[PDB]
């Protein structure tokens, strides 16, 4: 009876334990989120809802800073 060595490589359970995000989204997964969010934020500012455009632009810029100024000065 000899010794048997087993080494797991790329286990899906370990990789699921090694992240906190619900999905592993990338730029190619959602190809044109930026333009759609920007144009809907502009249409939101056409309406009387200025908070919601800030919310949607914050979601867009959070993802943009995740995968990679007039408000300063």
């Amino acid at each position: 009876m000899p010794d048997i060595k087993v080494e797991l490589l790329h286990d899906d359970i370990i990789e699921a334990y090694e992240q906190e995000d619900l999905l592993h989204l990338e730029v190619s997964d959602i190809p044109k989120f930026q333009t759609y969010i920007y144009q809907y934020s502009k249409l939101l500012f056409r309406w009387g809802l200025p908070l919601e455009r800030v919310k949607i632009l914050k979601v867009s810029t959070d993802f943009r800073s995740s995968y990679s100024s007039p408000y300063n000065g």
Binding site: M1, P2, I4, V6, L8, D11, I13, I14, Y17
Partner: protein, 632 residues
């Protein structure tokens, strides 16, 4: 082949091949019925030429020492024709002398490697004769045994018993070794293979004689109870040793041939041949020219020469491991753990390695993150509901959607019960898609992704890419007729593979439940009923089909509406001979619904009655007066 060097074909008849025992020559001899000659091979062009043509089983072995220019060919039974090599292209005849003493034919002979004048002989007369050249035979020992098959000398190689010993084999399977200096009745009488022993040979270094036989065995015998045994399985006729030094007995090569092929085995690995030279026709003889050159003839009348150091080995093309799977997750996974041995020096027995791959994987995962799939398969097989069970067609479709919604809800409930969310969500999606289709039927370019057909097909494709067999077969049961998912062949193949997978485990009732309500009618077999049993009557001998009773009860149940009248139909009565009932063998009561037939005598029985008699009473006989012990 790769190791083939010489392949010259001679159209004349060939019966044996040997070589000239001389280092400064490149000639080989041949034999035949009326064709004797010497052939010279040239290693430059890798071709064999002819030298001089001069013109019943025997040798074509040449002489030694100063008599190296002589050969021996049996001409007519008890004929010893000694030819010459120097006196070939001359006025003088190649023949030197003729010797005839044997009453029967001569089988084998050998020239001595030390005393070149002494020539041995032997045939069916059980006489061993020594012929002196520089001088009737010298010593004739009549052992009065059976016909001698092979006589060989002791090999006096150039590496006191150098050329004074010889051996012979009889048809009685006895190996006899004698001494030339002091002849006697028997110096060493050893047993051999049963029946007629055909051939033997001598080890060039140690006192060992390997004897062939017609039984298919080649046993190595100690002549200092065989030390080795190679069950070849074919009658061994010819064998030639490799003319090399061998300090170790196992460090030797033995060529075994009988359809005959040149199979160069090894003495340390008797189970695998080292070198095989099968040519294209069955062989008639073979010879070793040197330690690396081997020559032979075959039925194709071709003189062939091989180099054993350029010829590959069998050992190479011998699989060293294999892998098999027992089930899906990996509860059984074998791999042969063996060490690749060599032809030189036994072999340690390999350890066959099984592993519980899910258990070891779970242990590895729990160890790493610290900083039973079979039971689940059985449970999900047993508790999921695989089975389903112009305005009228619309109402039927509406009811089909409604109870499919109910079935999807039940399958989600059982998944949520075993706390598996990843498959609970699948059936929630399926239920919501069926609700969408139900409201679209009630209210009555590319398809949207949330359509009730595309979502179900995509979930099925994701399941069959993931490997979840239960869900990818459950969707194929529940959503095949109304929604065309895939080809009918692929769906039926998937149902069949799930059924065979269920049969691989000990879950047969679940397989029966799956197979009973399968909408595909030709999954397992095409003969229809293969559990149906037809009986002949015990009083008249006609077949119990009961057509009259079935017809009358069908007509009565058609008239009266209720179908409980058809429960009176059965095969426990005969309509031709008016048999009343079949009785139990133990209690003699009427028997209608379930029986337990005792096999060798053919008697009925209730389950409780037969189980009582064969288990509770511990009685091994049939309870109807039968002598045949149908025990247990």
């Amino acid at each position: 082949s790769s190791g083939l060097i010489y392949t010259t074909k001679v159209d004349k008849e060939l019966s044996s091949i040997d070589k000239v025992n001389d280092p400064n020559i490149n000639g080989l001899v041949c034999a035949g019925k009326t064709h004797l000659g010497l052939y010279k091979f040239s290693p430059s062009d890798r071709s064999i030429k002819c030298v001089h043509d001069f013109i019943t089983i025997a040798d074509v072995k040449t002489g030694f020492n100063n008599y190296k220019n002589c050969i021996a060919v049996c001409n007519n039974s008890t004929a010893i024709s000694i030819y010459d090599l120097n006196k070939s292209s001359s006025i003088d005849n190649p023949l030197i002398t003729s010797l005839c003493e044997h009453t029967r034919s001569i089988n084998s002979f050998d020239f001595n490697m030390v005393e070149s004048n002494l020539i041995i002989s032997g045939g069916q007369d059980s006489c061993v004769k020594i012929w002196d050249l520089r001088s009737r035979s010298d010593i004739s020992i009549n052992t009065a045994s059976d016909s001698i098959r092979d006589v060989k000398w002791m090999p006096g190689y150039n590496f006191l018993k150098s050329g004074y010993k010889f051996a012979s084999i009889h048809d009685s399977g006895y190996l006899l070794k004698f001494d030339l200096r002091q002849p006697a009745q028997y110096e060493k009488k050893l047993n051999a293979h049963t029946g007629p022993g055909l051939c033997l040979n001598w080890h060039p270094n140690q006192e060992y004689i390997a004897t062939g036989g017609r039984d298919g065995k080649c046993c190595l015998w100690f002549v200092g109870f065989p030390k080795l045994t190679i069950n070849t399985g074919y009658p061994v006729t010819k064998l030639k040793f490799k003319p090399a030094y061998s300090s170790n007995i196992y460090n030797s090569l033995l060529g075994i041939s009988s359809e005959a092929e040149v199979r160069i085995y090894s003495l340390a690995r008797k189970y695998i041949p080292k070198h095989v030279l099968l040519s294209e026709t069955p062989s008639l003889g073979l010879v070793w020219w040197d330690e690396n050159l081997i020559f032979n003839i075959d039925k194709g009348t071709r003189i062939n020469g091989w180099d054993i150091n350029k010829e590959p080995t069998v050992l190479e093309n011998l699989s060293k491991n294999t892998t098999t799977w027992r089930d899906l997750d990996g509860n059984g996974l074998l791999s042969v753990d063996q060490e690749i041995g060599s032809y030189e020096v036994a072999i340690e027995p390999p350890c066959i390695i099984t592993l519980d791959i899910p258990q070891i994987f779970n242990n590895i995962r729990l160890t790493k993150i610290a900083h039973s799939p079979v039971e689940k398969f059985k449970y999900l097989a047993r508790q999921l509901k695989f089975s389903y069970i112009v305005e009228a067609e619309l109402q039927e479709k509406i009811q089909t959607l409604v109870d499919l919604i109910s079935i999807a809800t039940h399958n989600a409930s059982v998944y949520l019960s075993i706390d598996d969310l990843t498959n609970f969500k699948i059936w929630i999606l399926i239920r919501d898609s069926l609700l969408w289709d139900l409201k679209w039927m009630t209210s009555s370019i590319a398809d949207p992704p949330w359509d009730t057909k595309k979502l179900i097909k995509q979930l099925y494709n994701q399941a069959t890419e993931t490997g979840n067999v239960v869900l990818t077969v459950n969707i194929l049961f529940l959503f095949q007729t109304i929604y065309q998912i895939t080809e009918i062949d692929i769906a039926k193949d998937a149902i069949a593979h799930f059924l065979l997978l269920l049969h691989r485990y000990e879950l047969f009732g679940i397989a029966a439940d799956v197979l009973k309500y399968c909408p595909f009618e030709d999954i397992m077999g095409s003969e229809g009923d293969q559990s149906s049993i037809r009986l002949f009557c015990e009083r008249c001998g006609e077949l119990i089909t009961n057509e009259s009773s079935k017809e009358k009860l069908r007509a009565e149940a058609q008239q009266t509406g209720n179908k409980k009248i058809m429960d009176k139909f059965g095969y426990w009565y005969c309509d031709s001979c008016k048999k009343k009932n079949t009785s139990c063998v133990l209690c003699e009561r009427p028997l209608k619904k379930l029986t337990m037939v005792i096999l060798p005598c053919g008697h009925e029985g209730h389950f409780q009655c037969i189980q009582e008699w064969f288990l509770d009473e511990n009685e091994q006989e049939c309870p109807g007066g039968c002598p045949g012990v149908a025990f247990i």
